[PDB]
């Protein structure tokens, strides 16, 4: 009954234990037998131990009888069995052990009958090959020893108290003699408890801490850590620590984490000398290595343990190991990174107003060649060094003011690192979300977090409204500096400019932006400038007008210059010098950057871009960069005009003008698609895909029937040229590494453009065939895009998608026969790969899918018999089709088999002893 | 026979424990670096079918221009 009560009896373990104690008082043997059977049932065994067994039969024999009397229906036993009732049972089982020790700890524990019986039975069960017995008994023995450790600790405390009482009495006769005798009996009790604890440790622990099952090992490791924490003077020794140190090297990560937590307790307690010095020296390298454990959670715990060790002594960790931990702040795993950032903050940034800490952060960021930006570093240390990271005042003072007596002026590289770090901290404070790869960024901000973010944003705005003009002026020549600094206003509250009467500083900032657009020809600088002007041009903020005015002026000047330049550039007799081309190119780059983010349709710049582009088509000496930026600018002109022409009130004839512009520009992009320079073709193809999507049928789908004239259907030549660009550029020969990654990303975006055309029915589905044929070939490079395209095309038309897949397989087949003779073996890796891709396609079936696959099989057999024997050539393709035979239902199989029998008549079905085996295999599959 | 779990070897032999202590290369790994360049970080966000199929090939920096591409999508 006891097992049932513990399992779900909903009775306090104290009551259960007290009832068992009453039973022990009435008959000790009967209660002992009930306890033995309790442990047996807790292992899952349905047998019962007899009183004769307990009286004479050895524990090993009893265990064997219980194994044969198990009546098990499965391998599950209560401790492994999942479910809330069994979790409650595990907890109640451990509590029963603890309370049983507690209630007997002053008498029955020293009776030396029930305790010895229990330890004997538990040891025997810990030796059992049966995992249920071993597991349950080991957990019970560890819980029992924890309780015994608490009993022995209380005995030691009480002994110290009686010795203190005797000492007081000796200072001052029968009372002190009483006290001496009480100490004597307490020491006898402690020796008895020590015998019990030694029995459990030497008979169970030293055998189960190295158990084959990882669960058992974890139980033992956790409980030895508990003993060390509970009774440090008696269990915090090398004799006990060695087991944790050894099992730190266990291949299983669960056990490793158990070891780490056990150690964390002791290292938190700050005993230091408590054998922890020797353990640290012995296993320091192991902990440092665990910082890079296969299991990330184990690694975080190891880093936290290293921080604890640092709090204990600091210098013990040495600088090399600290640097190992430092590298982890750049890890993709945010837990590891923030633990390492905490370690790094405590190592040097904690001891320290913040100016030297800011300089040290800059120096650390520069010393670590791992990252080129501080986003992930700042993220790692944002929770720890928030006061330092938010000391923007000290940072911009370091960048601005320099003469500070003995302080050495920062190197230009250090100044760039500092503006980078300042920008990253500003961004993380303005938007309370981590950089990509660390946090989702789409989490509802807490009320506290929203208030903190608002305070940081106001401080940033008011400080840098004045700081940023100065910073931009000081670093106007340096391009990276001005880009990073130009990203700051996007994190400002522009209402602060008006409310805080800072309009003068806004004007200075605007003038600085315009100055650097005039000075700079770098694309990133000009992009940052147009982005900043766009952020500042908010009609809802009061500063709009001012900024807008300045914006207009800039454009005006640029436009005028450009026009003049072009008048000389596009002249009947004007051989362009490299300076002339550079002039027109720089002004064009500025105008393109601003036209992307601003409506420059007032300046009517389509004429200039079109003239440049057609002159590049005719003359053929036009600079490639000029063509690229002119393509982009004409694209933006058309786009902005489309945005304007959305109401009949706006215009009607400009709609026709816009249609003409778009068609002409599409022809120009098609011409530049067939260009020698790959970058020109890439720009034209990119813009062309975006144009085709923007001006597709969907341009009228949502209440935009007035835009119905403004549609462009890709002509067959255009579709062919786009697919040819994909085939020539995206799919290439499969072969520093970061440059390869960048190239792969550009190719993926190109492929995704054409695939967007496919999935949104802008182009024919059949084109996708070629893309689909490269699904396995470029699974890593483009397989995600090909998979998404294939699924979308399935949803569009499953029957037509099946046709395109069979076309891809047919394309692989005749490509194989073109590369290698018709003697190709079925085992040849090429044909096997075609069959593998066919299986993959086949996985992609009663929801009209049966109809589509019937059509697929029809096309397959028609292809097989399309080429007849010269004295069927594509008989082999039947094997390919056999990959899809399984998805075909028997009822539909009859019809497709009728078609197949019509193809081979009857003689062929009989003739299959040699190379006709593919036909017979497909015939069987049917 | 019976489904009862009987482990013939209950213990890790001393040789396997010595091997665990001597070589822990199987249980260590290299550092998975977060995006080191700004461009790789931008590709971490912008790249990927979820964003690729919903974003233009030529980046449009004003939401008004982007809205055209997006409204044509689906």
């Amino acid at each position: 009954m006891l097992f049932e009560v513990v399992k779900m009896g909903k009775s306090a373990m104290q009551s259960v234990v007290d009832d068992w104690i009453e039973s022990y008082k009435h008959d000790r043997d009967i209660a002992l037998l009930d306890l033995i059977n309790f442990f047996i049932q807790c292992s899952g065994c349905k047998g019962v131990v007899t009183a004769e067994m307990f009286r004479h039969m050895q524990n090993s024999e009893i265990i064997r009888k219980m194994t044969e009397e198990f009546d098990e229906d499965s391998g599950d036993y209560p401790l492994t069995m999942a479910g809330p009732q069994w979790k409650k049972f595990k907890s109640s089982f451990c509590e029963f052990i603890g309370v049983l020790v507690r209630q007997c700890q002053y008498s029955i524990i020293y009776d030396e009958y029930m305790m010895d019986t229990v330890i004997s039975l538990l040891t025997g069960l810990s030796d059992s090959q049966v995992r249920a017995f071993r597991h349950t008994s080991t957990l019970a023995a560890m819980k029992l020893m924890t309780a015994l450790v608490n009993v022995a600790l209380n005995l030691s405390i009480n002994m110290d108290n009686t010795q203190r009482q005797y000492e007081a009495e000796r200072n001052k006769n029968e009372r002190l003699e009483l006290l001496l005798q009480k100490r004597k009996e307490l020491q006898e009790n402690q020796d008895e408890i020590e015998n019990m604890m030694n029995a459990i440790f030497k008979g169970v622990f030293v055998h189960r801490y190295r158990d084959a099952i990882a669960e058992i090992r974890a139980i033992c490791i956790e409980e030895i850590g508990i003993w060390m924490k509970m009774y440090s003077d008696a269990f915090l020794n090398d004799s006990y620590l060695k087991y944790v140190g050894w099992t730190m090297h266990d291949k299983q990560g669960e056990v490793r984490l158990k070891c780490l937590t056990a150690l964390q307790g002791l290292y938190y307690n700050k005993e230091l000398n408590s054998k922890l010095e020797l353990f640290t020296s012995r296993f320091k390298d192991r902990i440092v290595s665990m910082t890079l454990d296969k299991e990330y959670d184990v690694a975080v715990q190891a880093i936290k343990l290293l921080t604890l060790v640092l709090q204990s002594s600091e210098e013990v960790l040495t600088a090399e190991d600290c640097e190992n931990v430092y590298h982890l702040v750049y890890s993709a795993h945010r837990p590891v990174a923030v633990a390492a950032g905490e370690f790094l903050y405590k190592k040097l940034f904690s001891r320290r107003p913040n100016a030297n800490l800011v300089k040290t952060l800059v120096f650390f960021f520069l010393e670590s060649e791992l990252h080129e930006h501080a986003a992930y570093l700042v993220d790692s240390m944002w929770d720890c060094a928030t006061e330092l990271l938010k000391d923007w005042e000290c940072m911009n003072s370091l960048l601005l003011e320099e003469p500070l007596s003995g302080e050495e002026a920062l190197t230009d590289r250090q100044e760039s690192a500092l503006i980078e770090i300042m920008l990253c901290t500003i961004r993380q404070a303005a938007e309370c979300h981590p950089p990509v790869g660390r946090g989702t960024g789409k989490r509802v901000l807490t009320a506290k977090e929203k208030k903190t973010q608002l305070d940081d944003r106001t401080r940033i705005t008011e400080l840098f409204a004045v700081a940023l003009p100065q910073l931009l002026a000081k670093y106007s020549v340096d391009a990276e500096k001005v880009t990073n600094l130009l990203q700051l206003p996007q994190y400002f509250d522009l209402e602060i400019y008006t409310t805080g009467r800072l309009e003068k500083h806004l004007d200075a900032l605007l003038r600085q932006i315009r100055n650097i657009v005039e000075k700079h020809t770098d694309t990133d600088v000009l992009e940052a400038c147009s982005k900043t002007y766009h952020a500042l041009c908010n009609e809802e903020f009061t500063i709009f007008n001012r900024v807008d005015i300045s914006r207009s002026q800039l454009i005006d000047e640029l436009a005028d210059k450009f026009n003049r330049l072009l008048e000389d550039f596009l002249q009947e007799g004007e051989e362009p010098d490299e300076d002339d081309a550079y002039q027109v190119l720089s002004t064009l780059k500025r105008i393109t950057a601003f036209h992307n983010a601003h409506d420059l349709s007032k300046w009517d710049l389509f004429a200039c871009n079109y003239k440049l582009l057609k002159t590049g088509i005719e003359n053929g000496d036009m600079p490639e960069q000029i063509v690229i930026h002119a393509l982009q600018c004409a694209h933006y002109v058309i786009l902005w005009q489309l945005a304007k022409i959305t109401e009949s009130t706006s215009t009607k004839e400009d709609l026709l003008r816009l249609k003409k512009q778009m068609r002409v520009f599409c022809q120009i992009c098609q011409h530049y698609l067939t260009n020698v320079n790959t970058t020109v073709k890439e720009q034209a193809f990119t813009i062309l895909c975006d144009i085709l999507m923007i001006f597709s049928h969907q341009i009228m789908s949502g209440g935009r029937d007035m835009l119905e004239p403004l549609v462009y259907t890709p002509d067959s030549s255009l579709q062919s040229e786009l697919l040819s660009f994909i085939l020539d550029h995206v799919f290439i020969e499969q072969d520093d590494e970061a440059s390869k990654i960048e190239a792969l990303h550009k190719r993926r975006n190109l492929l995704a453009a054409f695939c967007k055309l496919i999935v949104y029915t802008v182009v024919e589905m059949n084109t996708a065939a070629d893309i689909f044929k490269q699904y396995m070939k470029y699974y890593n490079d483009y397989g995600d895009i090909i998979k998404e395209t294939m699924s979308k095309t399935r949803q569009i038309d499953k029957i037509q998608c099946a046709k395109t897949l069979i076309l891809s397989l047919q394309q692989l087949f005749n490509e194989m026969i073109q590369e290698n003779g018709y003697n190709f073996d079925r085992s040849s890796s090429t044909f096997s790969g075609i069959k593998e891709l066919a299986r993959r396609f086949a996985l992609t079936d009663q929801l009209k899918t049966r109809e589509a696959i019937a059509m697929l099989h029809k096309d397959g057999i028609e292809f097989a018999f399309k080429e007849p024997n010269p004295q069927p050539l594509n008989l082999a393709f039947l094997d390919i089709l056999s990959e899809f035979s399984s998805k075909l239902l028997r009822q539909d199989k009859r019809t497709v088999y009728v078609y197949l029998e019509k193809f081979m008549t009857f003689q062929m079905s009989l003739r299959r002893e040699d190379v006709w085996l593919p036909l017979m295999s497909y015939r069987n599959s049917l | 026979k019976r489904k009862l779990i009987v482990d013939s070897v209950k213990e890790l032999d001393s040789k396997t424990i010595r091997a665990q202590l001597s070589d822990y290369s199987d249980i260590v790994t290299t550092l998975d670096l977060a995006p080191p360049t700004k461009k790789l970080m931008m590709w971490k966000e912008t790249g990927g079918v979820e964003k690729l199929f919903f974003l233009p090939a030529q980046p449009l920096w004003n939401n008004r221009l982007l809205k055209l591409f997006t409204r044509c999508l689906t």
Partner: peptide, 24 residues
């Protein structure tokens, strides 16, 4: 020294009376 691993098992001598392990 204590941390140098020297344990070995499966060659342990079986206890005489498994029923009384606390004998001493």
């Amino acid at each position: 020294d204590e941390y140098e691993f020297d344990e070995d098992d499966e060659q342990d001598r079986v206890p005489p009376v498994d029923d009384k392990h606390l004998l001493k």
